[PDB]
Design a binder for this molecule. Structure first.
Ligand SMILES: *[C@@H]1O[C@H](CO)[C@@H](O[C@@H]2O[C@H](CO)[C@@H](O)[C@H](O)[C@H]2NC(C)=O)[C@H](O)[C@H]1NC(C)=O
Lengths: 186, 48, 124
């Protein structure tokens, strides 16, 4: 067996009709001579390699973008309150709904992907990072509620706690409420 | 409790501006896109 | 596909920017935004069935769902912006002269009216 190559490459692409999801970047042909266990004589083989790239505009639009938007919205929801001096509400129902949505999304990414157990796809790492961020945000909101609950046990915060709380207060864009200033002055 | 009242008013008017702005944006987006597709659908149906 | 998506978007928009009263703290409207986005995901999910993995162009229905999702997302951020302005009151400093001047002259154009308690405080 011998290969017959074209002007544009090994595999002729002058009649190829464009695919919606894949793009051919090139072609290769390799003539081989392989000895197999059965026959005591060589076998002439032709290896035709086709390099095809995926068009990553549908997956980015339909999967990555809504997931990132939902993650950003949930992040803002976790760490924003209507006031500084009233008890915060639990943000765990918010975390669980965001995770239901993202499950729905990874569900629709398992359809157009196999049970790849050898490597971790880039989109898999993306979804893992988003889920981890949502979970740690839920835990951090619970931590803020706990720190607020510390106030009802009577004991004041330590000296260093208030010094750092006051000197990192201008860096992050937060300002002390009027009632706190009035209490301090009184 | 008058500074709180005034900032309540500013947020209340800001909410109404957002309600009008987003309603107009939604109406233009939904009707404008669909009527453009219907225009393309109609023209190439009755003129080809 | 298009009709329920437009209705859900319209219902959510009213939810973001309508409150039960002017002088009470607003509740967060982010779970409202996240539930609307779950529904619209369910809908775009049922539009991917009868459509291929078109990565060359953006279909008209894809531009439709993109705009609705963008409107809901910015609407969620705009709703959180209203809560931020209300928190400015608790910091003591009053709004500036121009802020209250424009807030009073764009107040008759958009159909809003000043509450009685604000009038009583102004007169007092
Ligand atoms: C059968 O095929 C093998 C290749 O699998 C040939 O062995 C190679 O021959 C080339 C050319 O002389 C050498 O450069 C390689 O070092 C050889 N070994 C390899 C590639 O592993 C073998 O010569 C062929 N048999 C006959 C009779 O030609």
């Amino acid at each position: 067996y011998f290969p017959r190559t074209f002007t544009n490459g090994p595999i002729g692409l002058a009649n190829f009709l464009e695919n919606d999801a894949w793009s051919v970047l090139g072609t290769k042909v390799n003539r081989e001579e392989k000895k197999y266990t059965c026959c005591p004589v060589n076998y002439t083989l032709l290896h035709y390699d086709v390099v095809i790239q995926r068009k990553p505009l549908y997956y980015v639009l339909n999967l990555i973008a809504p997931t990132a938007v939902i993650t950003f919205i949930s992040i803002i929801g976790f760490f924003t309150s209507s006031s500084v001096h009233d008890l915060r509400q639990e943000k765990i129902t918010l975390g669980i709904t965001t995770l239901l949505s993202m499950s729905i999304m990874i569900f629709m990414v398992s359809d157009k992907m196999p049970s790849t157990s050898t490597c971790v796809p880039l989109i898999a790492l993306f979804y893992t990072l988003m889920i981890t961020i949502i979970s740690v945000g839920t835990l951090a909101a619970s931590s803020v509620i706990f720190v607020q609950k510390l106030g009802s046990i009577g004991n004041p915060p330590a000296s260093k706690t208030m010094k750092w709380t006051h000197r990192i207060a201008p860096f992050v864009l937060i300002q002390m409420p009027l009632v706190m200033k009035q209490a301090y002055a009184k | 409790n008058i500074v709180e009242l005034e900032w309540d008013w500013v947020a209340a008017v800001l909410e109404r501006v957002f309600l009008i702005f987003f309603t107009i944006c939604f109406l233009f987006s939904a009707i404008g896109i669909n009527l453009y597709g219907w225009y393309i659908w109609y023209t190439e149906n009755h003129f080809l």
